[PDB]
C-alpha cells in the first residue's frame, strides 16, 4: 500500500506530486469532498489530475468500472489508461509517489 497517503489534502497532493514526482507517479488519498471516498492524484504534464473513487458496499467504483479492492483498481490502471487526451495521449498509473 505504498500509494496510500491517507488524509493528505488536494493541495498537499499537488505539492508532493510536483516536488517529488515525475509523470505517472500517483497517490491515493482520502477524498476532501465526501467522507468515505478516495481520490487518485496523478502527476501529469502541465496540470495534475484527480479522479474520484467511490466506495459502495465494499466495491471500489471509478467511472463506470468496479473493483474488489483499491489494489485491484490501481493495478488495472497500470495496464489500461486512466485518462486519454484529445491528441491520443494515454496516461497510466506507473508508480506510487516516492
Amino acid at each position: 500500500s505504498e500509494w496510500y497517503y491517507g488524509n493528505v489534502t488536494r493541495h498537499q497532493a499537488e505539492c508532493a506530486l510536483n516536488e517529488r514526482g515525475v509523470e505517472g507517479d500517483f497517490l491515493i488519498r482520502d477524498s476532501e469532498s465526501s467522507p468515505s471516498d478516495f481520490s487518485v492524484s496523478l502527476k501529469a504534464s502541465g496540470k495534475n489530475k484527480h479522479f474520484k473513487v467511490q466506495l459502495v458496499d465494499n466495491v471500489y467504483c471509478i467511472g463506470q468500472r468496479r473493483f474488489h479492492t483499491m489494489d485491484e483498481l490501481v493495478e488495472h490502471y497500470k495496464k489500461a489508461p486512466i485518462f486519454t487526451s484529445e491528441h491520443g495521449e494515454k496516461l497510466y498509473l506507473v508508480r506510487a509517489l516516492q
Binding site: R10, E32, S33, H50, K52, A80, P81, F83, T84, K90
Partner: peptide, 8 residues
C-alpha cells in the same frame, strides 16, 4: 473541487 473525467 472539480474532478477529472476517468478514461473509458
Amino acid at each position: 473541487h472539480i474532478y477529472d473525467e476517468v478514461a473509458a
